[PDB]
UniProtKB/Swiss-Prot annotation:
Residues bearing glycans: 20
Entire protein: shown range: 101 to 269 of 469
Name of the featured protein: 22 kDa interstitial collagenase
Chain residue ranges for the region called Metalloprotease: 1-169
Gene designation: MMP1
Record-listed Ca(2+) 3 binding positions: 75-76, 78, 80, 98, 101
Site (Not glycosylated): 43
Superkingdom of origin organism: Eukaryota
Residues the record marks as active site: 119
Residues that coordinate or bind Zn(2+) 1: 68, 70, 83, 96
Binding, Ca(2+) 1: 24, 99
Binding sites annotated in the UniProt record for Zn(2+) 2: 118, 122, 128
Residues that bind Ca(2+) 2: 58, 90, 92, 94
Amino acid sequence: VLTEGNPRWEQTHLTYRIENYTPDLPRADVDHAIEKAFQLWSNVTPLTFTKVSEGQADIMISFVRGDHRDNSPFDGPGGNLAHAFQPGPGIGGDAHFDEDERWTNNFREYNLHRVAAHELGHSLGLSHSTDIGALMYPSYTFSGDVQLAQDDIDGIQAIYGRSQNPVQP
Ligand SMILES: COc1ccc(S(=O)(=O)N(Cc2cccnc2)[C@@H](C(=O)NO)C(C)C)cc1
Ligand SMILES: [Ca+2]
Ligand SMILES: [Zn+2]
Ligand SMILES: [Zn+2]
């Protein structure tokens, strides 16, 4: 409410649910990529995530093709590779992935885990940055290893706070 059309999550815990797995890759590989991404964000923040198989989740993930009842249809391999809505009630928090391209689990054409991590940044209220090491890169590019940069760590920690509890066990 304080922000016009871009409210932050007032909850310290969030839930998510995958509507379906793309036939390009099984669920074991996709669950790992989605689960690994949540761990990276929780590792540096006291935030906690939990997958729900029933009820509406705060962040819904689904794959779409061509027009899917939206005002931004994909135009072939060109255009954006994925998109989402600002964090808010209703369709807000939802995130769609372009299923017209083939997803891979390596440095092949595109990295699914790298894109999922970027979509979460949008759901976490993180905007694009001009830092080369920031995963929130506007266009798609090839980065070295997948790791959070100091700018991203300070940004999410600044909004909520620092994880004053680095207990691995
Ligand atoms: C790995 O991180 C990334 C995630 C998504 C993309 S994306 O090409 O789909 N894209 C960036 C874009 C494309 C074309 C022209 N202007 C801007 C969306 C975007 O920024 N998504 O986060 C946007 C246009 C909907 C790029 C990188
Ligand atoms: Ca495309
Ligand atoms: Zn969509
Ligand atoms: Zn983006």
